[PDB]
Amino acid sequence: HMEGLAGYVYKAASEGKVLTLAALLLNRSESDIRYLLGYVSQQGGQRSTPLIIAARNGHAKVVRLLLEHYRVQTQQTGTVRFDGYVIDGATALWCAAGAGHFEVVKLLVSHGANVNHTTVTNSTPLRAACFDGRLDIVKYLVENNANISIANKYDNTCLMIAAYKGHTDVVRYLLEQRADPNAKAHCGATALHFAAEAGHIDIVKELIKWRAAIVVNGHGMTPLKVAAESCKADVVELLLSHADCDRRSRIEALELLGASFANDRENYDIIKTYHYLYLAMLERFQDGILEKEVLPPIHAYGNRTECRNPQELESIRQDRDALHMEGLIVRERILG
Ligand SMILES: CC(C)c1ccc(NC(=O)c2cnccn2)cc1
């Protein structure tokens, strides 16, 4: 029967074999060609239609054919795979967006394809392109009325995801397209928070260029605190040339930043620990007065207590071991 021929059709489409395809759906009845073109094939949890697969694989030839001659539905939904995981509620356009197949995308759009369709997780194809970072698609999608405000299931904006990856060009474009930089997320995060977690110094600039608010994480984390805790020394410095709470925010960020050099085994630099830890102690001690509420010793970090005065810190400067502990103690205080 036809569940067999259906594959032979799904095959050709997936592989871009436009000739094989065309030959396969000639002298076929309209009732038949609809069945074949709409069949949903499962190739490893991947439920897809011929259109959808060819759109996912960048087979413009096959894609043009399906649309021009056979005039298959542009809204066919499906469940496709991308680098391991499988997304649900996808249209050909969604696959072509995140797969960077600009040629396929224009063609899909030019043949009247919903640019604002929302997958199961409510992910615009624009969202896909902002993840991928194929700026031309982004531009072109936006030029064809793709709504930027549409976030995801968790209120992750296209702006955020781009700030997560390093897509400085895309972020800047979205900002000019007036994407709200102060959008918040379920976890209570801003594009600024994300790029601050990464070390996306260029993007953190543009957000600041665009008067991004300093909000708090659902954890109670400024973008600064995030970056200092994520051990992104540069970002911290930049972000600190702005309206940081006079001393409290500042000293904490420095204290945490320096502590994050003892904890983080990737970036591990104790010298940088004492540098920032001693810096912060100074900010604490120029008016004498801002003072440290120190926690009691514990077995966890040796029966040690954090330093409260510069002289206490100055003594540790040469004790690689003691400094390692201090950073832990310090981080323990600021975070818990
Ligand atoms: C759950 C949330 C709504 C979300 C939606 C789509 C993506 N998209 C990709 O991860 C991707 C990567 N590479 C190519 C194409 N797409 C990520 C997160």
Residue numbers in the entry: 0 to 287, 290 to 337
Please quote the authors directly:
Protein fem‐1 homolog B (FEM1B) is a substrate recognition protein of the Cullin‐RING (CUL2) E3 ligase and plays a critical role in regulating proteins in the cell (Chen et al., 2021, 2024; Hughes et al., 2021; Kramer & Zhang, 2022; Manford et al., 2021; Raiff et al., 2025; Zhao et al., 2021). FEM1B plays a crucial role in balancing the reductive stress response in the cell by degrading key proteins involved in redox sensing and management (Manford et al., 2021). FEM1B binds multiple degron substrates with distinct recognition sequences, which suggests FEM1B has multiple recognition sites for substrate binding. Here, we describe the development of a stable construct of FEM1B, the results of a protein‐observed NMR‐based fragment screen using this construct, and the X‐ray structures of some of the fragment hits when bound to the protein.
The X‐ray structures were determined for six additional molecules (VU0412674, VU0417412, VU0421763, VU0023775, VU0081201, and VU0432623) in complex with FEM1B. The six additional molecules which are classified as chemical shift pattern 3 sit in the same binding pocket. The other six fragments bound to the same site in the FEM1B substrate binding pocket, a region typically important for identifying C‐terminal prolines of degron substrates in a non‐covalent manner. When the most potent non‐covalent molecules, VU0412674 (KD = 0.26 mM) and VU0417412 (KD = 0.28 mM), are bound to FEM1B, Tyr84 forms a polar contact with the amide carbonyl of the molecules. This, along with Phe130, causes this portion of the binding pocket to “close,” locking the fragments in place. The position of Y84 appears to have a significant impact, with the “closed” position providing an increase in binding affinity by locking the molecule in place.
